[PDB]
Design a protein around this nucleic acid. Structure first.
Length: 462
RNA sequence: AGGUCUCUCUCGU
């Protein structure tokens, strides 16, 4: 991924965009009960905590594109992957515009709580002004496609979120690309039938976890897996993906019956952006807040591991490779240890820089005791070893509870952390309840017990 | 101040 030019919006007649500057994250009643090192990521150049140039920092994510031509390894990775997807027999029909707006089985309606992008936002128009849920009115939307068309500019925003102190002072805040309401809809009409089929089939065929409830799905996973596992960590995966890879994605899309719409992958590969008072073009890298980012990133991720395996294990039967990906994240098995230490080399050529799983320095071997996926570990139930707990570690939960974006939801926030916390087990969980109850506000909360949550778990495999 | 998924809470037939 690499920028190409950048200039003052008014140079090109583009408006200034209001990008807010005050984090909504304020410390909570519980800020001092628990311990945590994480702080609200940086939003402007005049930040006390800053240690370098902001603008420089944030756009650094674009390191450049390496490969640009589907090599002979990639081309075969396409075939196998596309082959699997074919087993699913995916409806290739364009999605009904009414469906692509307000949703259908397997695909949720557009989000009315979020911005419509450019140009709707420069006039101050809101998704809620074009869309009505009861009527499910298509008309006015349809005029806006005739009007502004597709392939519109993405509005870039800084994410408002807690990050590590280094990341805060070092300036490595994350970046959102806000989809025009125009393209979300057009993307959907095309790939809506693709999106759902995925949403309906998390697993090792699709190779995507998009759509799985971890509380139930953590137990089905070890079954759908080979013996020796492997895993690693990407650096900047998104803003580092290279034009070749899209051509690879388009190829899989051709091979499964989506040949016409492959146009839209170019508008993701080659995109243009309004950051405040700047404008700029970018060759490569997924745009994050565009439609299908979960499903495309995932699909590409399926191609990479498939590829990089081949470059190393010439003569490896990919027909026994079992992976599930969630964008960059991934958990994967082959009956023999596919030494990840190497893969990360074959990577840095393809623009991909892979580090060892979970900030370890060394490429540790992977096991069902140290493997994470969607930030949760695997622990069999003490009473039913065929039942696996997804374990978010207390540390992360601590970090969440120290802040809030509105004390109104204090109750909901905390209830919500217990539903994650209690898989660590009765002792740790009851310890967590007492720390909450250590302050007056905590003692206000209606929280569930271990026995109720555990009951509920078992019940739901029923 | 984006795209999604899961869970949960609140109110409705």
């Amino acid at each position: 991924g690499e920028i190409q030019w950048m200039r003052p919006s008014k140079e090109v007649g583009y408006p200034i965009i209001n990008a807010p500057s005050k984090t909504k994250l304020e410390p909570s009643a519980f800020h001092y009960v628990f311990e945590g090192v994480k702080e609200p990521a940086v939003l402007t150049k005049n930040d006390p905590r800053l240690k370098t140039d902001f603008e420089e920092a944030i756009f650094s994510k674009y390191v450049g594109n390496k490969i640009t031509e589907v090599d002979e390894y990639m081309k075969e990775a396409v075939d196998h992957y596309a082959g699997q997807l074919m087993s699913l027999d995916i409806n290739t029909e364009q999605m009904c515009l009414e469906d692509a707006m307000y949703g259908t089985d397997g695909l949720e309606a557009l989000d009315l709580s979020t911005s419509a992008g450019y140009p709707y936002v420069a006039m101050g128009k809101k998704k809620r002004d074009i869309l009505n849920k009861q009527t499910r009115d298509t008309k006015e939307m349809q005029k806006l496609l005739d009007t502004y068309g597709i392939n519109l500019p993405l509005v870039t925003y800084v994410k408002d979120e807690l990050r590590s102190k280094t990341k805060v002072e070092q300036g490595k805040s994350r970046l959102i690309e806000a989809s025009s309401l125009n393209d979300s809809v057009a993307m959907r009409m095309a790939f809506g039938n693709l999106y759902a089929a995925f949403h309906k089939n998390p697993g090792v065929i699709t190779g995507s976890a998009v759509g799985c409830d971890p509380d139930l799905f953590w137990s089905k996973i070890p079954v759908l897996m080979e013996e020796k596992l492997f895993a690693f960590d990407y650096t900047g995966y998104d803003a580092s993906l290279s034009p070749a890879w899209f051509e690879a994605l388009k190829m899989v899309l051709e091979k499964i019956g989506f040949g016409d719409r492959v146009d839209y992958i170019d508008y993701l590969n080659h995109s243009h952006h309004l950051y405040k008072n700047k404008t700029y073009c970018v060759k490569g890298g997924m745009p994050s807040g565009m439609s299908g980012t979960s499903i495309f990133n995932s699909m590409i991720n399926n191609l990479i591991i498939r590829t990089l395996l081949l470059k190393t294990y010439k003569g490896i039967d990919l027909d026994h490779l079992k992976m599930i990906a969630y964008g960059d994240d991934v958990i994967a098995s082959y009956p023999h240890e596919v030494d990840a230490s190497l893969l990360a080399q074959s990577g840095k050529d393809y623009g991909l820089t892979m580090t060892p799983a979970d900030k370890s320095a060394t490429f540790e071997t992977v096991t069902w005791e140290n493997v994470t996926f969607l930030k949760r570990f695997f622990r069999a139930d003490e009473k039913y070893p065929f039942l696996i707990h997804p374990v978010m570690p207390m540390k992360e939960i601590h970090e969440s509870i120290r802040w809030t974006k509105d004390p109104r939801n204090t109750q909901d926030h905390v209830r919500s952390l217990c539903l994650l916390a209690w898989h660590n087990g009765e002792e740790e969980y009851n310890k967590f309840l007492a720390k909450i109850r250590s302050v007056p506000i905590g003692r206000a909360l209606d929280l569930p017990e271990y026995s109720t949550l555990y009951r509920r778990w078992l019940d739901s495999f029923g």
